[PDB]
């Protein structure tokens, strides 16, 4: 029969926290086994570095300007539009979705779905059944999503149709609540700060004006768990709501671990660089405790597929809705076109008939997933899709007409973290960014000389011709993808 697809996508995972990409921080042996028996994309990006927009780009193969899902705060996905799950059903597939959806409208084009409301919760999450009833799933969401994915494959799947299963995790979303079994891990880990952790944002006004600084914005109580009745913070009430979901046993285990860390913190006088360093270590540790459950649960899926003899005829994909700042530029979160958040990890275990192993370097984006899946399914690829099937790359081809540039557009401002709206072009060599709301500011980076984007070159006479050439190339992409911002900054959402 046609190939199956198992697509696993996390929330705010990132290459820096996957050992197949980066060995500074975290071991991810189960994620690494997907890449090891397949390929890893070294130049993998998103079109709009935010969860809902990324999820709309994923299912449509289109930039936000065409799918109309611009942000997490003002949009409801019009599910009448073309999506790859519906096209796969029309090609004889069954389709299934578990976990985070984050498109506001109910999933369509799925034979089975069971999702969280909005962002979901780590402990004792509510879910929404396919009848739009709310149910309680007691336990820890990374385990529960996996349980339901495997239950669907084992007991619900029609054995007479090929399938596409989407497994959409809440891990590793803020505020990084570990499962009971992992509470104690990584306390023996202390990391060097990133070289640009104390970035002064010279030449970069949108970098200066964000509210996603570990030092300044990360919340001692909500993010770093330092709750005590005599302490207050902006997000203390939200913190108490989220850990308030825990039952007595879950909270007792939580407190057994955190109570000593709380006591040790409040005994100290910490400020400035010493406090920023303390916050970074706690952030990294809690993030990594949260990754551990995710890696183990991806292992469960991998081991199940292997035992059932499904891997030979199944593409296994692992990615994140976007990358994430692990202290680069002093940040957490995403949103910017800057490299760490424009990038997203992408690894695939390749089925029988694809011998390629190792690294793929051609520039790929989340708008490419839909046409890839349709081609692998033997389904027609509609011309209105913006992305390009990656199947030639999986086959070891280097197409002469492969793209030389990617487009990007981020829209969610004013909003949480206060990242200005911006669009831009990224080539193999350069990135040109236009921040357009609520400032008018261009930036140019030489990604070869300056891969950490510390030196805005825009306005230097020796880069005038490069900047003008990139504007011409970017306008051609805006024409290709029909982004009306090319006409006026006020026409960014038409
Ligand atoms: C207080 C709090 O947790 N705020 C987070 C933000 O840091 C995050 O930026 C936003 C969007 O993330 S997204 O859904 O991954 O795009 O989700 C909120 O839940
Ligand atoms: Ca996310």
Closest residue to atom 14 of ligand 1, CA basis: 51
Is 12 annotated to bind a ligand? Reply is: yes
- Position in ligand 1 atom list of the atom nearest CA 322: 15
Give the C-alpha separation, 392 to 444, whole Å: 31
Residues with CB under 6 A from ligand 1: 11-12, 50-51, 72, 119, 173-175, 235, 333, 416-417
- Tell me if residue 189 falls in helix, strand or coil: coil
Q: If we measure between CA atoms, which residue out of 478, 488, 489 comes closest to residue 65?
A: 478
Give me the sign of the Cα torsion angle 88, 93, 99, 104. positive
Q: Which long-range contacts (CB under 8 A, 24 or more apart) does 238-241 make?
A: 239/175
Give the C-alpha separation, 190 to 353, whole Å: 44
Give residue 333 CA to ligand 1 midpoint distance, Å: 8
Give the C-alpha separation, 88 to 65, whole Å: 24
Give the C-alpha separation, 16 to 13, whole Å: 9
Pocket test for ligand 1, best of 13, 47, 72 (most atoms within 8 A of CB): 72
Give the C-alpha separation, 118 to 128, whole Å: 10
In this structure, what token pair is assigned to residue 91?
A: 């090609």
- Tell me if residue 171 falls in helix, strand or coil: coil
Give residue 469 CA to ligand 1 midpoint distance, Å: 36
Neighbours of 458 (CB within 10 A): 17
Give the C-alpha separation, 85 to 108, whole Å: 8
In this structure, what token pair is assigned to residue 340?
A: 């760490």
In this structure, what token pair is assigned to residue 455?
A: 């030196």
Give the C-alpha separation, 136 to 138, whole Å: 6
- Tell me if residue 111 falls in helix, strand or coil: coil
In this structure, what token pair is assigned to residue 228?
A: 């005590």
- Position in ligand 1 atom list of the atom nearest CA 235: 1
Give the C-alpha separation, 92 to 111, whole Å: 11
Pocket test for ligand 1, best of 10, 70, 101, 119 (most atoms within 8 A of CB): 119
Give the C-alpha separation, 334 to 343, whole Å: 10
Partnered with residue 431 across adjacent β-strands are 426, 445
How far is it between the farthest Cα atoms of the chain? 65
Give the C-alpha separation, 432 to 467, whole Å: 7
Closest residue to atom 13 of ligand 1, CA basis: 51
Give the C-alpha separation, 442 to 420, whole Å: 12
Domains in the chain: ranges and CATH: 4-175+288-403 (3.40.720.10), 205-283 (no CATH), 406-491 (3.30.1120.10)
Give the C-alpha separation, 482 to 407, whole Å: 11
Give residue 233 CA to ligand 1 midpoint distance, Å: 17
DSSP tag of 203: T
Q: Spell out which residues have Cβ within 5 A of ligand 2, the ion.
A: 11-12, 51, 321
Kind and range of the H or E run holding 99: strand 94-99
Is 286 annotated to bind a ligand? Reply is: no
Pocket test for ligand 1, best of 10, 51, 170, 235 (most atoms within 8 A of CB): 51
Is 11 annotated to bind a ligand? Reply is: yes
**Cα distances (angstroms) measured from residue 53 to each of 184, 382, 411, 447:** 35, 21, 10, 25
In DSSP notation, 246-282 reads S-HHHHHHHHHHHHHHHHHHHTS---HHHHHHHHHHH
CB neighbour class for 234 (10 Å; exposed up to 12, middle 13-18, buried from 19) = exposed
Give the C-alpha separation, 54 to 365, whole Å: 10
Kindly provide the residue ranges of all beta strands, DSSP E only, lying in 327-450, ordered along the sequence: 346-349, 358-360, 364-365, 405-410, 421-427, 430-437, 441-446
Closest residue to atom 10 of ligand 1, CA basis: 416
CB 436 within 8 A of CB 492: yes
CB 13 within 8 A of CB 31: no
Query: Within 114-247, where are the H helices?
Result: 141-151, 205-209, 236-243
Closest residue to atom 18 of ligand 1, CA basis: 174
Estimate to the nearest angstrom the gap between the alpha carbon of 190 and the chain centroid: 25
**Pairing mode, strands 38-41 and 358-360:** parallel
Give the phi and the psi of residue 10 in degrees, each rounded to 5. Answer: -90, 175
In this structure, what token pair is assigned to residue 209?
A: 């004006």
- Position in ligand 1 atom list of the atom nearest CA 332: 7
Is 384 annotated to bind a ligand? Reply is: no
Give residue 195 CA to ligand 1 midpoint distance, Å: 25
Give residue 117 CA to ligand 1 midpoint distance, Å: 14
């Amino acid at each position: 029969k046609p190939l199956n697809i198992v697509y696993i996508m996390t929330d705010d995972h990132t290459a820096q926290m996957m050992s197949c990409y980066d060995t500074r921080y975290m071991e991810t042996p189960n994620l690494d086994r997907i890449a090891e028996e397949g390929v890893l994309f070294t130049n993998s990006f998103v079109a709009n570095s935010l969860s809902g927009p990324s999820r709309a780009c994923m299912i449509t193969g289109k930039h936000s300007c065409a799918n109309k899902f611009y942000d997490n705060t003002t949009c409801v996905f019009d599910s009448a539009q073309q999506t790859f799950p519906k096209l796969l059903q029309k090609a004889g597939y069954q389709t299934a979705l578990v976990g985070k959806w984050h498109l506001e409208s109910l999933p369509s084009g799925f034979n089975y779905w069971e999702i969280v409301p909005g962002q979901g919760d780590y402990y004792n999450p509510d879910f929404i059944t396919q009848n739009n009833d709310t149910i309680r799933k007691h336990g820890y969401i990374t385990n529960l999503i996996t349980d339901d994915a495997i239950d669907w494959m084992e007991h619900k799947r029609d054995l007479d149709k090929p399938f596409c299963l989407l497994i959409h995790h809440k891990a590793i979303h803020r505020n990084w609540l570990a499962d009971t079994c992992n509470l104690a891990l990584y306390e023996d880990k202390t990391f060097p700060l990133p070289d640009n952790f104390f970035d002064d944002y010279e030449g970069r006004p949108a970098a200066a004006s964000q509210e996603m600084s570990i030092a300044k914005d990360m919340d001692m109580i909500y993010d770093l768990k330092m709750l005590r009745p005599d302490k207050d913070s902006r997000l203390k009430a939200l913190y108490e709501k989220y850990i308030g979901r825990m039952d007595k046993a879950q909270r007792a285990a939580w407190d057994k671990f955190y109570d000593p860390i709380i006591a040790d913190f409040y005994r100290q006088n910490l400020q400035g660089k010493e406090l920023a360093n303390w916050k970074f270590q706690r952030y990294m540790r809690d993030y990594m405790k949260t990754v551990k459950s995710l890696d183990d649960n991806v292992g469960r899926v991998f081991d199940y597929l292997k035992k059932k003899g499904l891997l030979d005829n199944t593409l296994v994909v692992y990615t994140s809705d976007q990358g994430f700042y692990m202290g680069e530029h002093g940040w957490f979160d995403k949103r910017f076109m800057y490299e760490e958040s424009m990038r997203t990890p992408l690894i695939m275990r390749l089925p029988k008939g694809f011998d390629r192993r190792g690294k793929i370097t051609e520039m790929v984006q989340n708008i490419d997933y839909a046409p890839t899946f349709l081609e692998l399914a033997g389904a027609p690829v509609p011309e209105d899709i913006h992305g390009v099937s990656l199947v030639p790359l999986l086959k070891g081809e280097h197409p002469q007409d492969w793209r030389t540039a990617l487009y990007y557009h981020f829209y969610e401002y004013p909003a949480e973290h206060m990242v200005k709206r911006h669009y831009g072009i990224r080539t193999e060599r350069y990135k040109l960014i236009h921040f357009y709301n609520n400032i008018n500011w261009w930036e140019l980076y030489d990604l070869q000389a300056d891969p950490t984007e510390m030196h805005n070159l825009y306005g230097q006479p020796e880069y005038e011709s490069i900047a003008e050439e990139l504007k011409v190339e970017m306008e051609k992409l805006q024409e290709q993808y029909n982004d009306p911002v090319r006409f006026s900054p006020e026409r960014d959402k038409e």
